Amino acid sequence: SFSGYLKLTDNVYIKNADIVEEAKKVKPTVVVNAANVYLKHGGGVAGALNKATNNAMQVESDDYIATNGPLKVGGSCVLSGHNLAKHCLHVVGPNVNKGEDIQLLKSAYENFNQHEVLLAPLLSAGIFGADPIHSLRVCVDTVRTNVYLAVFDKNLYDKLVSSF
Numbered sequence: 507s508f509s510g511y512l513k514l515t516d517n518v519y520i521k522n523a524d525i526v527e528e529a530k531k532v533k534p535t536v537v538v539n540a541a542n543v544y545l546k547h548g549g550g551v552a553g554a555l556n557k558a559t560n561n562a563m564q565v566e567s568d569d570y571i572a573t574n575g576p577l578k579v580g581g582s583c584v585l586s587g588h589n590l591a592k593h594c595l596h597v598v599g600p601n602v603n604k605g606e607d608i609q610l611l612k613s614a615y616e617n618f619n620q621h622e623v624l625l626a627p628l629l630s631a632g633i634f635g636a637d638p639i640h641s642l643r644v645c646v647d648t649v650r651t652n653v654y655l656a657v658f659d660k661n662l663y664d665k666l667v668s669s670f
């Protein structure tokens with residue numbers, strides 16, 4: 507049910523859209539969250555997805571951390587998608603503003619290969635501080651399953667396409 511995407515490769519598609527609005531429209535099997543290790547969904551993609559769930563994502567996430575402890579940078583966990591998707595795959599890309607290793611970005615994108623099709627944002631981009639052009643290149647060179655990327659900023663979308 508994905509519509510209006512530009513094909514980049516055999517398996518990677520892109521659209522200028524808010525991932526929350528795309529998830530509400532499509533109700534995909536898997537929506538990816540740009541999470542941190544504590545699953546504290548304050549801003550960016552995570553804060554916007556959590557707000558759209560009426561804070562249910564945060565309540566579930568707090569129970570997950572109380573039981574399991576924090577995720578690893580480069581790691582993931584599968585939780586409910588609430589009203590947005592069947593599942594949410596919470597993936598932790600490195601936060602360059604905190605000195606985390608950018609080489610962990612490839613490990614973060616490898617989590618996508620466990621799912622046949624995903625709606626996702628660019629990992630480590632936006633408020634996580636990494637170069638979005640680099641994040642798109644690692645995505646295309648790492649993910650083998652079908653990924654539909656939603657990029658909120660129109661100016662950045664146009665730059666990603668024109669430099670691909």
Ligand SMILES: CC(C)[C@@H](Nc1ncnc2[nH]ccc12)C(N)=O
Pocket residue numbers: 523524525526550551552554627628629631632633638656657658659662
């Ligand atoms: C990861 C970033 C490059 C990107 N953020 C996002 N991209 C897609 N849906 C989103 N909802 C809330 C944030 C958000 C951006 N700022 O264009």
